[model samples]
Target: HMATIRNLKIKTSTCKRIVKELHSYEKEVEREAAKTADMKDKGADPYDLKQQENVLGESRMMIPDCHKRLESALADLKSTLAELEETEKEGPEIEDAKKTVADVEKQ
Candidate 1:
């Protein structure tokens, strides 16, 4: 019973926030990628461009951080849905939820 309630709360409430945060992370990743690409286009040599080095490093770090956040959100979403399946024996519910998440996650 408690597990069911927990799963329901996570599915209904936390998932939305997680998805929002994941999307934000994805956007940040895109922004960072653009920055890196722009820098390269502008002929930025990381070793030589001492002035732009900080911003370049920031973008590089952001890409990895955003990637991890996206991965974590997907993993949490899947695990939470799986918990609903295991606890409530609701195969269809879990299946539908997985489909929805997968569709949204498709790049």
Candidate 2:
């Protein structure tokens, strides 16, 4: 087993990306939740409610995929960074850590 550097700078960078993705997921969830709420406010039928639920469900499912990618990337970064720290001390591995920064740069 390899020991990770536990580098604050690198972990902080990864966290920022995670936050951005989570924010995106939250925004989308809010939008879908609003859609569902709007329909309910107008006294939607059971069938219609179920349909809306399905839509929201799909949106909800995407949240995990987004988080999972970030987590996986961060874990990889930790592993790779640990490898570098144990050997090189300072190197391009930090750049590799930055590659985990994902985003939804559109509204």
Candidate 3:
């Protein structure tokens, strides 16, 4: 039971951390997309637009899966928290888990 709780906490933490990277990646894609759009408005070449579109497409592909994983991890954390409360356990382990959950929520 303790190990399961620990794993859930770790999973949630990992997901929260990676979500920052995903956000940065999303921002990069948007910036590039805007740049490409601006270039297109100025009559950029077909080849350049195609290359830019490909870059955008690759970055866009990563976003949905990252979001899905993060959502799943959050759900897992919520459910695990409920279970932990039901168990009425206490000590350093429980305290750590609670603190970790709070941190995850902040993220």
- CA lDDT of each prediction against the hidden true structure: 0.60, 0.66, 0.73
Candidate 1, which segments miss by more than 4 Å at Cα? 1-49, 87-100, 103-107
What lDDT is obtained when candidate 3 is compared to the true structure?
Answer: 0.73
Could you say which candidate leads in lDDT? 3
Worst 10 residues of 1 by lDDT: 8-17
Per-model TM-score on C-alpha atoms: 0.46, 0.58, 0.68
In order of listing, the candidates' clash counts read: 0, 0, 0
Give candidate 3 misplaced runs (Cα > 4 Å): 1-5, 88-107
Residues 1-107, model 1: lDDT tens digits: 55654564555344455556557666765766666677778998876455455555665575555556556666776777766657565555465566657754762
User: Model 3 clash pairs?
Assistant: none
Better of 1 and 3 by lDDT: 3
- RMSD to the hidden true structure, all candidates: 4.8, 7.4, 3.7
Error of 2 at 60 (Å): 0.5
Mind sharing the TM-score for model 3?
0.68
Summing lDDT over every window of 10 consecutive residues in candidate 2, give the lowest-scoring window.
Answer: 98-107
* Best-performing candidate as measured by TM-score: 3
